[PDB]
Amino acid sequence: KIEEGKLVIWINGDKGYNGLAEVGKKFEKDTGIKVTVEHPDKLEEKFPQVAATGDGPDIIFWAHDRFGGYAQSGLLAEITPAAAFQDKLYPFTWDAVRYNGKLIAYPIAVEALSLIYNKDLLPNPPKTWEEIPALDKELKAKGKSALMFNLQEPYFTWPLIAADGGYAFKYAAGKYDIKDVGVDNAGAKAGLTFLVDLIKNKHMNADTDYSIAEAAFNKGETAMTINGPWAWSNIDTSAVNYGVTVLPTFKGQPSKPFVGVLSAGINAASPNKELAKEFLENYLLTDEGLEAVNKDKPLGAVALKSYEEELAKDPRIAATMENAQKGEIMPNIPQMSAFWYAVRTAVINAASGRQTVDAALAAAQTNAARAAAIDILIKIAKALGISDRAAKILAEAAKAAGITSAEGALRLANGEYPEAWKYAIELAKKRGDDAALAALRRAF
């Protein structure tokens, strides 16, 4: 299924994969194992299916939070680097890749939202959200505005709501607690309230999305935007001369973006686990390799201390890592999908004036722990007409398959995840559910 004596690597198509392919070059020269790099479309959702049968690639590169679901189905191999090699990377990245107390992948790069400003409009951008309304009065006198960032997706509006003490789920003892949710507390109500007052006072407009904000910045009609390093590309294309820096504080406390950690995991069914560990530890993660990748396409901030030091000479990248350490690791537990669907709603209806900030954080807080992909899937099966018990068996098989996201549920409900449907069939036979075995066999 997976060839022994050969390394196969999946990484997304927006990373530089010819750099990774060059690390593969020298690894072939010295060892004699051949490294095959490919960039499947939607690899992230193919892996949990194909690895469940034991085939697939050796190493998968992706964001750290998607690795929660992979690991919980045991799809990723467990890595045991020495403390000597562990000190070569930033500790918080390690805590990004720890599932259940085991490290399920190697951290590679780091990314978070930052504050981006137009140097010609605003040589000295502000340190606090509170400065922004008055700065926007000034720039409106020149026909411009202070700030435009995407208001529709809570990934972007979250850091302000987090600054004064909102959070997704309490994280301590290296462990998240889904009974502690930070949506209704005074901090989140303060941040969201500030955002809503910003909109009431016409400094920002509730309909601004990623695209509108991007266009306005790169035409130079606005002084500041909030965005991540993926955006930098298009800004370089434009005539705007920009800089990147720390996000504003709110009520004295720094804004907290969620941090993605680009990470390399190893297929638990991979025949080459030792080879892979050698290639990633001693070949990819070094200044040589990280640079090969980086100048194929830039990784932004990286987890390897030695190379991040020399990369932070570019103030944008040091600004991204600083914003990252001020922020929080994106959680890899499933319930956060629910959290997003909740907060999205809460922002949009507060921003648009359809709910007060209180009412809407109350609603939102109730829905945050609910692991919504599962009840999506079950509502879908009930919609087909399938029985409760059959829905729940398919749900069991879903959790066991590591399905945390709505898309996953609809991929299953459409006939994908073969071993998931199977395993639901096995559970049906085991307990003698003939009606559920039939409904499942027919739905599949």
Angle at the Cα of 368 (from 365 to 370), degrees rounded to 5? 135
Rg (Cα) of the chain, in Å, rounded?
23
**Cβ distance 51 to 43 under 8 Å?**
no
> How far is it, in rounded angstroms, from Cα 224 to Cα 149?
8
> How far is it, in rounded angstroms, from Cα 261 to Cα 188?
25
> How far is it, in rounded angstroms, from Cα 160 to Cα 191?
5
Residue for token digits 């298009």?
Answer: 234
Q: Tell me the residue type at 88.
A: K
Q: Is 430 exposed, middle or buried (0-12, 13-18, 19+ CB in 10 A)?
A: exposed
**Cβ distance 320 to 300 under 8 Å?**
yes
- The DSSP bridge partners found for residue 336 are none
PDB resolution in Å: 2.8
Residue from 341, 337, 359, 357 nearest 188 by CA: 357
**Cβ distance 113 to 228 under 8 Å?**
yes
**Cβ distance 120 to 224 under 8 Å?**
no
> How far is it, in rounded angstroms, from Cα 212 to Cα 9?
36
Secondary element (H or E) of residue 423: helix 418-430
CA neighbours within 13 Å on the CB side: how many for 408? 30
Secondary element (H or E) of residue 27: helix 17-30
Q: Is 49 exposed, middle or buried (0-12, 13-18, 19+ CB in 10 A)?
A: buried
* CA trace torsion 251, 254, 256, 260 (10° rounding): 170
> How far is it, in rounded angstroms, from Cα 223 to Cα 216?
9
> How far is it, in rounded angstroms, from Cα 431 to Cα 417?
22
**Cβ distance 92 to 40 under 8 Å?**
no
> How far is it, in rounded angstroms, from Cα 3 to Cα 17?
21
> Determination technique for this PDB entry?
X-ray
Collect all residues with Cβ–Cβ distance below 8 Å to 107 and sequence separation of at least 6. Answer: 64, 89, 90, 93, 94, 96, 97, 261, 262, 263, 303
Residue from 107, 112, 115 nearest 302 by CA: 107
Phi-psi region of 224 (alpha: psi -120 to 50; beta: other; left: phi over 0): beta
Residue from 300, 323, 376, 402 nearest 70 by CA: 402
**Cβ distance 91 to 83 under 8 Å?**
no
Sign of the Cα torsion 154, 156, 160, 163 reads positive
Collect all residues with Cβ–Cβ distance below 8 Å to 330 and sequence separation of at least 6. Answer: 63, 64, 65, 96, 258, 259, 260, 261, 336
Measured between its terminal Cα atoms, the distance across the chain in Å is: 25
The structure tokens listed for 153 are 């997706």
The structure tokens listed for 367 are 């829905």
Strands 253-254 and 249-250: antiparallel
Q: Tell me the residue type at 228.
A: G
DSSP-derived 3-state class of residue 403: coil
> How far is it, in rounded angstroms, from Cα 348 to Cα 307?
40
Residue from 196, 203, 154, 162 nearest 181 by CA: 162
The structure tokens listed for 303 are 């987890």
**Cβ distance 410 to 375 under 8 Å?**
no
Q: How many CB atoms lie within 10 A of CB 111?
A: 25
The structure tokens listed for 428 are 């049906």
> How far is it, in rounded angstroms, from Cα 392 to Cα 385?
13
Q: Is 202 exposed, middle or buried (0-12, 13-18, 19+ CB in 10 A)?
A: exposed
DSSP state of 284: I
Q: CATH homologous superfamily for 112-258+333-367? A: Periplasmic binding protein-like II (3.40.190.10)
> How far is it, in rounded angstroms, from Cα 92 to Cα 64?
12
Sign of the Cα torsion 247, 294, 285, 404 reads positive
> How far is it, in rounded angstroms, from Cα 314 to Cα 80?
33
Distance of alpha carbon 332 from its chain centroid, rounded? 9
Collect all residues with Cβ–Cβ distance below 8 Å to 242 and sequence separation of at least 6. Answer: 116, 117, 118, 119, 217, 235
Q: Tell me the residue type at 410.
A: L
> How far is it, in rounded angstroms, from Cα 164 to Cα 271?
48
Q: How many CB atoms lie within 10 A of CB 316?
A: 19
DSSP-assigned states of every residue in 178-204:
EEEEESSSHHHHHHHHHHHHHHHTTSS
> How far is it, in rounded angstroms, from Cα 411 to Cα 261?
26
Q: How many CB atoms lie within 10 A of CB 85?
A: 13
* CA trace torsion 154, 156, 160, 164 (10° rounding): 60
DSSP-derived 3-state class of residue 28: helix
**Cβ distance 247 to 113 under 8 Å?**
yes
